[PDB]
Each structure stands twice: as structure tokens, then as C-alpha cells.
């Protein structure tokens, strides 16, 4: 569990529901991470480069209950409901695998181990085909659009994937994060 968070982020979402998960400041191109726990609404996003992969929702998003984990990738989407007791700031990790010589995804940056559960379902991806001009997807209606920025479960968080950089092995940065994302959320 990586403690990847920002500070002093304004709440512009309501009126209009817009919100940026990774705000980007001009200074140094700084990426500001805010993936808050919201009361449970639908969201919508342009999903640039498939950064958003999924989301998690449930009563406590903690142990002694269950939450729903929905995550998409290029070949399928998997949904599970379990006592995940997942990371406060969960992400789908993306790392380079040297033996298979490819990039691979990891859920162990979302949660550690799940306790006893039974529900699982698998289907074709519903988020990944971006047909390539922002093309907004609303929660599951995918429509063409230009850049005009226009039209028990108690709480939830979204899940972004992070494409780890490989700069230096020494401790200059974690290199864990990359890119920026947003989703507009409300009733």
C-alpha cells in the first residue's frame, strides 16, 4: 500500500460535478493525487489512455464487511465481491516483467489478501475500447464528443492504473506514477 496523496485540493464538484483525480500543476508538471472516498451516484470520463480501469464500492471499504471490486484490462473485466480491506489509496500497478518481456498489471497495489468470499464474474472489457475527439463514457454510454467538458454500499473510490517509470534504481523518486486523470461525479 503506497501513501500517494496530495494536499490543499479545492472541491469544484457539486450545479456542476467535475473533479480531477490527478490535478496537474504547471510547476514542474506536478501530479497531485486525490482519489477520495465519496458517498454512493454515477461518474463519467473521457478516459484518456485508459488510465481509469475501475472502481471500488461498499459500506465501509474495510474489513468485517464486503466491497465490490471492478477492474478492466485489454482482454476482459473482472468483478469480485469480497472482504478486501484494501489500500486507502489503491491503484492498479503496471510494471515491466523481464522474463515474459512485457508489461503486466497487479492487483496487489489495490489490496493485499482477501478474506473468505464467493462472488466472481468475468466479461469482455467495457471501458477499454476508446476507438483510437475525447469521446466521453458515462456510467455505460460511450458517445463521441469534442473537448467542451459538457454532458450495502455507502461509499466508493475510483481506480487508476499507474505505469511505473524506469529512470534510476537509486532513491530519486518511487517512479510509481505516470499521467493524469479525471472523472466528473454526482447524482
Amino acid at each position, epitope marked *: 500500500c503506497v501513501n500517494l496523496t496530495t494536499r490543499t485540493q479545492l472541491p469544484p464538484a457539486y450545479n456542476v460535478t467535475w473533479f480531477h483525480a490527478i490535478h496537474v500543476s504547471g510547476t514542474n508538471g506536478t501530479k497531485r493525487f486525490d482519489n477520495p472516498v465519496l458517498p454512493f451516484v454515477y461518474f463519467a470520463s473521457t478516459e484518456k489512455s485508459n488510465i481509469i480501469r475501475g472502481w471500488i464500492f461498499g459500506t465501509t471499504l474495510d474489513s468485517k464487511t464486503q466491497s465490490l471490486l471492478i477492474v478492466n484490462n485489454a482482454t476482459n473485466v473482472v468483478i469480485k465481491v469480497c472482504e478486501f480491506q484494501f489500500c486507502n489509496d489503491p491503484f492498479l500497478g503496471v510494471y515491466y516483467h*523481464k522474463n515474459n518481456k512485457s508489461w503486466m498489471e497487479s492487483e496487489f497495489r489495490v489490496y493485499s489478501s482477501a478474506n473468505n468470499c464467493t462472488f466472481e464474474y468475468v466479461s469482455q472489457p467495457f471501458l477499454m475500447d476508446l476507438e483510437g475527439f475525447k469521446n466521453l463514457r458515462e456510467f455505460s454510454k460511450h458517445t463521441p464528443i469534442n473537448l467542451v467538458r459538457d454532458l450495502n454500499i455507502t461509499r466508493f473510490q475510483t481506480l487508476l492504473a499507474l505505469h*511505473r517509470s*524506469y529512470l*534510476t534504481p*537509486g532513491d530519486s523518486s518511487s517512479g510509481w506514477t505516470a499521467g493524469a486523470a479525471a472523472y466528473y461525479v454526482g447524482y
Partner: antibody
Amino acid sequence: QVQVIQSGAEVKKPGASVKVSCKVSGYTLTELSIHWVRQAPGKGLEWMGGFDPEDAETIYAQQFQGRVSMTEDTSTDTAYMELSSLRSEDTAVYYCATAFAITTVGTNYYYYYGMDVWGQGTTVT
Amino acid sequence: IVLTQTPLSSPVTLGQPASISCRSSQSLVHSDGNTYLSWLQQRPGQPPRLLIYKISNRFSGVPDRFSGSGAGTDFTLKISRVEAEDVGLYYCTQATQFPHTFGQGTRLDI
């Protein structure tokens, strides 16, 4: 931050191998190239072999032609090396050195070579 | 592939500049032009640490005093000022060929 962790010292009689571990933390072995180096007074700093991402396999030095073996316990993020070709004059400090298998420029990761993070090393016969 | 060495005595006066160098017996042209050569420093009681990750690529914790700049296989590790506790063995590396090597190791010596 790779954090390479080495085993302690060990002395064995000729022909016996000493299996030396290499534990990493911050990056899994899956992400890293592992290289091994020998060091001694009178010999200097010598590369024994290591992972080469283009072929994605371990390449051994032109010397240490055999009776040397490198493996990876990827499940525990711990790499290992042993040398059975021990004549005792091979007592040396052995080091695990690592580097990222790749570099990143946007999404083009090419291949990366280097030996950027070294563990403390161990003295073994 | 062999890395040559300048005299290993590398005499030191603190606060004064110093430099060491090596050349290659084989071409350093990497398919991507990466030229994967680098420099390390070994203080007593420890492993060598890499100072310069590439030729000109310095890593954090290593002061601006150090640079690996060079060309034509001739690479010089330049120290703008050798300061207290910069003294140990110094090596150039070679990772442009399948076999990898190290130079003999110069020693900064007060």
C-alpha cells in the same frame, strides 16, 4: 529505491559451493536485472555474469565457463548464485548488483544496462 | 572488451581538481546509441557505489563535482574539487558488449 540485501560470510573446503542470496525491496526481482561480481586483492573487480533483457536470459562471463549457476526465487524476491568450481583461491567478496531491466521514455522502454545498486557483499570461500 | 587505465596513483590535494580516465579496446556503439558505460567509487568497508549512471548522467547523492564526459571511447571522470571523504577506488565500467567488465581501479591518494 532497490535496497539490495546480502547474506553473511561462509567458508567451505575446495569443491564445495556456497549459495549466496540477494534480496531486493522497492522493486521486485521481476523488474530487475541481477548481476554478480567477484572482488579480491590481486584480482580487482570481476563480472561473473547476469541478466540481459534483450535476450531476457542470464549471460555468463567468458571465464567461469561452468560450475557457476545463477537462479531466481521470484516468489520471495530473492536471487541466488553458487560456484562449485572452488579451489579456495576464489575466496572473494561476492556482490549482487542490480539495474532496471528497462528504462522509460514515454512508452518506449528500449533496454537498460547498468549495475546501479550494489548490496554490501559477502566474503565467501 | 578491455578498459585501459591512466596511472592509478591519482595524487590528491583536497580542494584541488582531479581526473582519471580509460579507453576501450572495442567499439562502444550500442544499437540505440546508448553507450552504456558508467563510473563507480569504492570507499573502504563497503561495495562500490555507482556515481555516474551513464556518461553524463549523474545520480542523486553524488555532488556536481563529478562528471563522466568523454568521446571516442575515451572517458574521463572529472572531479572539480576532491573534497574530504571523496577518497576511495574508482572504476569505469563497460556494458556495451555481451561480456561486461571493469577497469583496474584508480585510487585517489592524498
